[PDB]
């Protein structure tokens, strides 16, 4: 995520990274955890598109 752009890089689990984006657009973070599988399937299919 943004830490390296800030400066010295910091590792973070990827799902945690996705959580804070949804925090950034106002949606509560529980949605990501409850529908991770659908989100992943859509992302891969979009790569196919």
């Amino acid at each position: 995520g943004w830490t390296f752009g800030a400066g010295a890089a910091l590792q973070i689990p990827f799902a945690m990274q996705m959580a804070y984006r949804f925090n950034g657009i106002g949606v509560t973070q529980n949605v990501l955890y409850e529908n991770q599988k659908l989100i992943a399937n859509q992302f891969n299919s979009a790569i196919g598109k």
Partner: protein, 70 residues
């Protein structure tokens, strides 16, 4: 970890992330380390535990619990 079970229901931190030093579990803001005691009024509930991945076991302390007997 992403979340902690208390009793059937799940809990999520209002801001920051959950951290552990091996001894116990705490919550902190992401830009400056300053651990805090996990309380009721730092998290909120949504859904059930079976949905989420990576959840762990602990107990949430209620500040009102030791004083409700008064």
């Amino acid at each position: 970890a992403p979340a902690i079970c208390h009793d059937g229901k799940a809990h999520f931190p209002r801001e920051g992330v959950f951290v552990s030093n091996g001894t116990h579990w705490f919550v902190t803001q992401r830009n400056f380390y300053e651990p805090q005691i996990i309380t009721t009024d730092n998290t909120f509930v949504s859904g059930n535990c079976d949905v989420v991945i990576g959840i762990v076991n602990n107990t949430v302390y209620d500040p009102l619990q030791p004083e409700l007997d008064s």
